[PDB]
Amino acid sequence: GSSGSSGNDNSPRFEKSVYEADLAENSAPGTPILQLRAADLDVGVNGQIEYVFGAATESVRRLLRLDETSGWLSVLHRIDREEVNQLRFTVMARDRGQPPKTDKATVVLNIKDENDNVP
């Protein structure tokens, strides 16, 4: 046929397939959203797992910032629920291989509102 991998692989895998979190539209250009874990089930690896942008837009890469050295996802520029009611992108995680086994993980962010907080 075409392919049929079978065996064992220490490829990078995120805890949650689709990271769902609520982001307050009134989130500063440097507000922490969430963190992308890469559990390797090795009780601690040699730190060979980074976090980069997989399938995102040009307005998402400039509106949000993600650290590859730590893997922490936060805001980069002001967010206006008006311009966006709900963002949706994907993050990749390289480990080993050329190209390295990159794992994709959907990240749903619900643009909430702080001003619309019930009294």
Side-chain angles (χ1 to χ4, degrees):
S2 173
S3 206
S5 309
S6 168
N8 309 282
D9 274 297
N10 291 341
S11 291
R13 283 203 196 75
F14 294 98
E15 300 210 35
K16 310 169 273 181
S17 306
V18 182
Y19 277 57
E20 207 157 51
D22 81 308
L23 197 275
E25 64 180 79
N26 202 92
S27 278
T31 298
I33 304 157
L34 53 90
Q35 173 154 44
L36 306 162
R37 269 287 150 163
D40 280 296
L41 289 156
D42 294 307
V43 68
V45 296
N46 305 118
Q48 298 282 101
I49 311 283
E50 40 273 353
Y51 317 89
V52 296
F53 268 40
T57 78
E58 57 275 278
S59 210
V60 172
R61 61 177 197 188
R62 76 182 297 87
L63 169 75
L64 301 149
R65 172 91 275 201
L66 165 83
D67 273 312
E68 148 160 310
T69 173
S70 81
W72 269 92
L73 212 169
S74 67
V75 183
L76 190 66
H77 278 318
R78 293 159 293 186
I79 292 161
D80 210 310
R81 178 270 187 159
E82 281 177 311
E83 74 153 48
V84 290
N85 43 287
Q86 176 163 329
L87 304 150
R88 210 190 70 158
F89 50 80
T90 320
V91 291
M92 274 202 310
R94 305 177 278 158
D95 186 351
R96 298 203 179 195
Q98 45 191 249
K101 286 277 200 182
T102 57
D103 195 324
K104 278 172 201 167
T106 307
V107 173
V108 175
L109 304 175
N110 273 262
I111 301 292
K112 293 285 211 205
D113 202 334
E114 317 275 82
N115 159 65
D116 91 333
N117 88 128
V118 62

